[PDB]
């Protein structure tokens, strides 16, 4: 979203029952919205306002924090929201499309589509078109409509696969259509010709974005988490970004007149990619990331109470601040032979990775002097130490000397008040 | 400059009746359109004048017309 009175771009991501706003310059949080009773299912932005849908009712947010307008009158869940000037377009599950004036909250027009014949799966309003919207269907047909006249201008036979994405190309009359088979079709809607076709064998087309910084590059996402970069000029594949996100790609967008790509996913990560390297190799520029796996153990750390230590199934220890997210920090992965990790990075060294932490105990005294966290891993005899100030794993693995095998495991850990000693229990029944 | 450069060297399938009409829309008193005005005379532009105005703003924002588009 672009902003008035501030020549900056803002990116808004849905977080459960709320949404967050970040500046794209430095990924700094600028606002947090108020909660809504149900989980947000669809979102839209028109510069002035942010629209969020939950259940069968959707509301409009002002100042990125509070609601000012709510709209009732839908009997089914909403999957699509299209801002249209001072009006908003909402599409229901059963097939009802209603145009609402935002301020007066009245219903301008109500249109219904047969679910068997034409179920809407994608909506697009082409640029420089007067009162015209483009509708895509799972059956595969496309319909061009005029809201003002309330008549069907033209019907595109399309393709038998079905439409999953609609995106405006950097041209007056050209749109990009994604299909369930993995095929991207560049089409001119005025004269009905297909300029070019691209195909990826990774599943349905999730999202499409166009690079407008002077290089003709198109990006399409996949549910596998891969992104394909296609050259529009030469009609070829430039390069592929594999495992950009571990989960499915949700939305990818090139910043306007910028060589930057903004991606998010279900792995609780928001990432920025810059294509400035040789041969157009994208690299990670900035990221705001949390735990990508369900949590195992969480405990308050410190008597002041502004931070909480959390462990997850991804094999990482992290601290979350309770006052502001600028103080969030990560202690890294559980890794033996840390010096090898420096040489090769986290990847290609998956062998030295430790099993996820199940239980841990932390003590705050002597944290400057030495380690203050003891943790026991899943199905592992030894217990590992962690350092809070150094934000990394410790230098000791605490085990009985006589045992070497992993048939016996560690079950209970504790640390003393002074922090000098740690007490570890074993499944065999020995306490050391 | 142009002299120096020399020395160195269908039919649309659909139509909209609301667009063919020569009706005028208020460029002023609309928040989005008032930023698109050029001189004071264009308080209300016709349908044809609006189309080329909208088109050239899109091309200026996009940085021109891409080569693959034609």
């Amino acid at each position: 979203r672009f902003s008035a009175l501030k020549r900056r771009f803002y990116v808004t991501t849905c977080v459960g029952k709320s949404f967050h706003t970040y500046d794209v310059q430095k990924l700094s949080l600028v606002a947090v919205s108020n909660s809504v009773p149900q989980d947000i299912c669809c979102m839209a932005a028109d510069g002035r306002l942010v629209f969020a849908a939950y259940g069968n009712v959707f509301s409009a947010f002002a100042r990125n924090k509070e609601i000012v307008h709510t709209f009732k009158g839908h009997k089914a869940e909403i999957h699509f929201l299209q801002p249209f000037g001072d009006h908003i377009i909402s599409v229901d599950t059963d097939g009802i499309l209603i145009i609402w004036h935002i301020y007066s909250e009245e219903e301008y027009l109500q249109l219904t589509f047969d679910k068997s014949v034409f179920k809407i799966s994608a909506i697009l309003h082409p640029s420089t078109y007067l009162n015209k919207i483009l509708l895509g269907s799972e059956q595969g047909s496309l319909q061009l409509w005029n809201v003002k006249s309330n008549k069907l201008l033209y019907t595109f036979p399309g393709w038998k696969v079905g439409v999953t994405a609609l995106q405006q190309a950097p041209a007056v009359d050209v749109v990009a259509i994604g299909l369930m088979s993995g095929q991207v079709i560049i089409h001119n809607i005025k004269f009905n010709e297909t300029l070019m076709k691209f195909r990826q064998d990774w599943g349905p087309i999730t999202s499409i974005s166009f690079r407008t910084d002077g290089h003709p590059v198109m990006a399409a996402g996949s549910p596998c988490g891969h992104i394909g970069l296609w050259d529009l000029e030469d009609k070829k594949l430039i390069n592929q970004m594999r495992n950009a996100h571990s989960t499915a790609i949700a939305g990818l967008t090139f910043l306007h007149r910028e060589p930057l790509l903004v991606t998010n996913g279900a792995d609780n990560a928001l990432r920025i990619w810059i294509f400035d390297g040789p041969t157009g190799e994208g690299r990670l520029l900035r990221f705001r990331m949390g735990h990508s796996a369900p949590l195992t153990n969480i405990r308050y750390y410190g008597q002041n109470g502004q931070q909480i230590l959390s462990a997850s199934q991804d094999g990482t220890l992290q601290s979350f601040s309770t006052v502001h997210e600028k103080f969030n920090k990560s202690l890294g992965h559980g890794l033996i032979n840390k010096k090898r990790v420096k040489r090769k990075g986290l990847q290609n060294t998956m062998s030295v990775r430790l099993p996820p932490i199940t239980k841990f105990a932390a003590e705050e005294a002597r944290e400057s002097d030495w380690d203050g966290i003891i943790a026991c891993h899943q199905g592992k005899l030894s217990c590992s130490t962690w350092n809070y100030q150094k934000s990394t794993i410790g230098a000791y693995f605490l085990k009985p000397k006589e045992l070497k095998k992993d048939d016996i495991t560690a079950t209970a850990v504790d640390i003393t008040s002074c922090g000098n000693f740690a007490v570890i229990g074993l499944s065999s029944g020995t306490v050391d | 400059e142009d002299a120096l450069l020399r020395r160195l060297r269908k039919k649309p399938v659909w139509v909209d009746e609301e667009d063919e009409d020569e009706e005028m829309v208020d460029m002023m008193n609309n928040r989005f359109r008032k930023d698109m005005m050029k001189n004071a005379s264009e308080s209300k532009l016709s349908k044809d004048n609006l189309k080329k105005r909208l088109k050239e703003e899109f091309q200026h924002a996009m940085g021109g017309v891409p080569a693959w588009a034609e």
Partner: peptide
């Protein structure tokens, strides 16, 4: 957009 606000 040029839709009328009311009706």
């Amino acid at each position: 957009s040029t839709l009328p606000t009311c009706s």
